[PDB]
Scaffold this active site. Structure first.
Site, PDB file in Angstrom:
ATOM      1  N   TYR A  83      25.220  53.098 -12.789  1.00 15.68           N
ATOM      2  CA  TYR A  83      23.835  52.605 -12.832  1.00 15.68           C
ATOM      3  C   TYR A  83      22.894  53.725 -13.282  1.00 15.68           C
ATOM      4  O   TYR A  83      22.075  54.236 -12.514  1.00 15.68           O
ATOM      5  CB  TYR A  83      23.401  52.027 -11.482  1.00 15.68           C
ATOM      6  N   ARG A  88      16.333  52.479 -18.064  1.00 15.03           N
ATOM      7  CA  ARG A  88      16.860  51.603 -17.030  1.00 15.03           C
ATOM      8  C   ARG A  88      15.746  50.712 -16.493  1.00 15.03           C
ATOM      9  O   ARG A  88      14.614  51.167 -16.296  1.00 15.03           O
ATOM     10  CB  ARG A  88      17.415  52.463 -15.897  1.00 15.03           C
ATOM     11  N   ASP A  89      16.075  49.440 -16.250  1.00 15.73           N
ATOM     12  CA  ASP A  89      15.116  48.432 -15.787  1.00 15.73           C
ATOM     13  C   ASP A  89      14.061  48.190 -16.875  1.00 15.73           C
ATOM     14  O   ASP A  89      12.920  48.644 -16.806  1.00 15.73           O
ATOM     15  CB  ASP A  89      14.517  48.840 -14.427  1.00 15.73           C
ATOM     16  N   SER A  95      12.834  50.333 -10.703  1.00 21.72           N
ATOM     17  CA  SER A  95      14.090  51.067 -10.772  1.00 21.72           C
ATOM     18  C   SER A  95      14.192  51.939 -12.019  1.00 21.72           C
ATOM     19  O   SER A  95      15.300  52.314 -12.418  1.00 21.72           O
ATOM     20  CB  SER A  95      15.290  50.126 -10.661  1.00 21.72           C
ATOM     21  N   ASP A 135      21.649  44.738 -13.976  1.00 19.62           N
ATOM     22  CA  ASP A 135      20.366  44.578 -14.646  1.00 19.62           C
ATOM     23  C   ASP A 135      20.346  45.263 -16.011  1.00 19.62           C
ATOM     24  O   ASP A 135      19.383  45.945 -16.369  1.00 19.62           O
ATOM     25  CB  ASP A 135      19.207  45.058 -13.767  1.00 19.62           C
ATOM     26  N   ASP A 313      14.399  47.589  -2.572  1.00 20.50           N
ATOM     27  CA  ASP A 313      14.406  47.147  -3.960  1.00 20.50           C
ATOM     28  C   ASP A 313      13.260  47.720  -4.775  1.00 20.50           C
ATOM     29  O   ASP A 313      13.276  47.619  -6.007  1.00 20.50           O
ATOM     30  CB  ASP A 313      14.285  45.619  -4.041  1.00 20.50           C
TER      31      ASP A 313
HETATM   32  O1  LIG Z   1      19.974  46.060  -8.866  1.00 20.20           O
HETATM   33  C1  LIG Z   1      19.620  47.258  -9.506  1.00 20.20           C
HETATM   34  C2  LIG Z   1      18.189  47.693  -9.033  1.00 20.20           C
HETATM   35  C3  LIG Z   1      18.101  47.755  -7.531  1.00 20.20           C
HETATM   36  O2  LIG Z   1      17.588  49.066  -7.146  1.00 20.20           O
HETATM   37  C4  LIG Z   1      18.548  50.043  -7.131  1.00 20.20           C
HETATM   38  O3  LIG Z   1      19.309  49.872  -5.882  1.00 20.20           O
HETATM   39  C5  LIG Z   1      20.413  50.826  -5.797  1.00 20.20           C
HETATM   40  C6  LIG Z   1      21.130  50.487  -4.519  1.00 20.20           C
HETATM   41  O4  LIG Z   1      20.244  50.473  -3.436  1.00 20.20           O
HETATM   42  C7  LIG Z   1      19.873  52.252  -5.812  1.00 20.20           C
HETATM   43  O5  LIG Z   1      20.967  53.153  -5.970  1.00 20.20           O
HETATM   44  C8  LIG Z   1      18.904  52.473  -6.946  1.00 20.20           C
HETATM   45  O6  LIG Z   1      18.231  53.735  -6.772  1.00 20.20           O
HETATM   46  C9  LIG Z   1      17.884  51.380  -7.045  1.00 20.20           C
HETATM   47  O7  LIG Z   1      17.102  51.575  -8.239  1.00 20.20           O
HETATM   48  C10 LIG Z   1      17.163  46.767  -6.854  1.00 20.20           C
HETATM   49  O8  LIG Z   1      17.641  46.648  -5.503  1.00 20.20           O
HETATM   50  C11 LIG Z   1      17.106  45.437  -7.482  1.00 20.20           C
HETATM   51  O9  LIG Z   1      16.032  44.643  -6.922  1.00 20.20           O
HETATM   52  C12 LIG Z   1      16.745  45.620  -8.986  1.00 20.20           C
HETATM   53  N1  LIG Z   1      15.962  44.915  -9.801  1.00 20.20           N
HETATM   54  C13 LIG Z   1      15.960  45.505 -11.019  1.00 20.20           C
HETATM   55  C14 LIG Z   1      16.773  46.633 -10.931  1.00 20.20           C
HETATM   56  N2  LIG Z   1      17.226  46.706  -9.686  1.00 20.20           N
END
Ligand SMILES: OC[C@@H]1[C@@H](O[C@@H]2O[C@H](CO)[C@@H](O)[C@H](O)[C@H]2O)[C@H](O)[C@@H](O)c2nccn21
Length: 358
Positions: A83, A88-89, A95, A135, A313
């Protein structure tokens, strides 16, 4: 399929989540709720390599797993999330990560993968299962009018390909993220999704280590709903089993008999959203079905816990550069800290509302 990555192995419990859970539990005041909370550390979860800073700890997990297997007569399996894509995002802020496309992001991502491969290569007696880039590819189905996603398309495809191609060389079993029933499970999104995942699979050489897809990662959908959540109006695929039942034959028809894993870590409580797209710290969620290979579906290798419940999140602080207003909605628990960081009150509610009970 014939080869379920989990059969014959013991899952190495995440030390990262165990450390969060232990600290969280000792502050939970009721003896019974505290003991239930502490027991969450014994539930297998995926540990996220959300930055290069997490790579050294991967090395420790592999070496610890190797020794634990020798000490207990078992073969050990380490569960990771890849990830760290650049940009990213692409469709929101919460994120956004350390690499950017404009600053050598694809090359930096290659190096991130190379470092991970170099760790995994040193521990061949440990199996690794990886979820590939939550994502990411799902945005290239429905979100190409988001200009950041459109401009990231070639990089996302190239970087995911590099990850698949090079993790396969060290025998990592891989499930690519595939959104959830309310994202790619809309009937009209199924074929575009199947076409994309098949193209990605083809570009990566159709490696047999690329087992299939992961769904509901960091989401809250039921696997098998008792009745459709009203947020699902208009979509006959109202839960993950309907989505997977509908997508899997398309992948088969396209040449890939893919299998699936489904996150249920925050799925214990249904009917807690105003809109299906709501995703941020959804208030009142509970821990869901424990990980198991008894999945109820020919297509599903395992129910899993991918998003670690208790890790936020997204922040609800509108001064943060990572603020998404989804995180201040009436269905978002507030105040909430930055994505990935510990959200104690949310964890305690996940424990209290666990279904099945802890
Ligand atoms: O699922 C990928 C990420 C996620 O955060 C991600 O969660 C991971 C697990 O806790 C962490 O390691 C990351 O730092 C965080 O960015 C969100 O929980 C979700 O709501 C979402 N929406 C878009 C991206 N993301």
């Amino acid at each position: 399929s014939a080869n379920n990555p989990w059969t014959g192995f013991q899952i190495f419990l995440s030390p990262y989540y165990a450390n969060e859970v232990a600290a969280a539990a000792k502050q939970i005041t009721d003896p019974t709720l505290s003991s239930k909370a502490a027991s969450v550390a014994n539930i297998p979860t995926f540990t996220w390599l959300d930055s290069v800073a997490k790579i050294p700890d991967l090395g420790t997990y592999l070496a610890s797993a190797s020794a634990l297997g020798k000490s207990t007569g078992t073969k050990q399996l380490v569960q990771i999330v890849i990830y760290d894509l650049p940009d990213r995002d692409c469709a929101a802020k919460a994120s956004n990560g350390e690499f950017s496309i404009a600053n050598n992001g694809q090359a930096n991502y290659e190096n991130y993968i190379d470092q991970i491969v170099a760790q995994i290569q040193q521990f061949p007696d440990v199996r690794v299962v990886a979820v590939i880039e939550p994502d990411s590819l799902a945005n290239l189905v429905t979100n190409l009018n988001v200009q950041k996603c459109a401009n990231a398309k070639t990089t996302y495809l190239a970087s995911v390909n590099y990850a698949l191609t090079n993790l396969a060389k060290v025998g990592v079993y891989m499930y690519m993220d595939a959104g959830h029933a309310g994202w790619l499970g809309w009937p009209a999104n199924l074929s575009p999704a199947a076409q994309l995942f098949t193209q990605v699979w083809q570009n990566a050489g159709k490696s047999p280590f690329i087992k299939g897809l992961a769904t509901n990662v960091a989401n809250y959908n039921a696997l098998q709903a008792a009745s459709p959540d009203p947020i699902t109006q208009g979509n006959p695929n109202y839960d993950e089993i309907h989505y997977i039942n509908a997508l899997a034959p398309l992948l088969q028809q396209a040449g890939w008999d893919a299998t699936f894993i489904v996150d249920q870590g925050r799925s214990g409580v249904q009917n807690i959203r105003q809109q299906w797209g709501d995703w941020c710290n959804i208030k009142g969620a509970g821990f869901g079905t424990r990980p198991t290979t008894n999945t109820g579906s020919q297509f599903i290798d395992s129910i899993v816990w991918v998003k670690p419940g208790g890790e936020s999140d997204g922040t609800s602080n509108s001064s943060s550069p990572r603020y998404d207003s989804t995180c201040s909605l009436p269905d978002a628990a507030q105040p909430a800290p930055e994505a990935g960081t510990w959200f104690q009150a949310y964890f305690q509610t996940l424990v209290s509302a666990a279904n099945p009970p802890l």
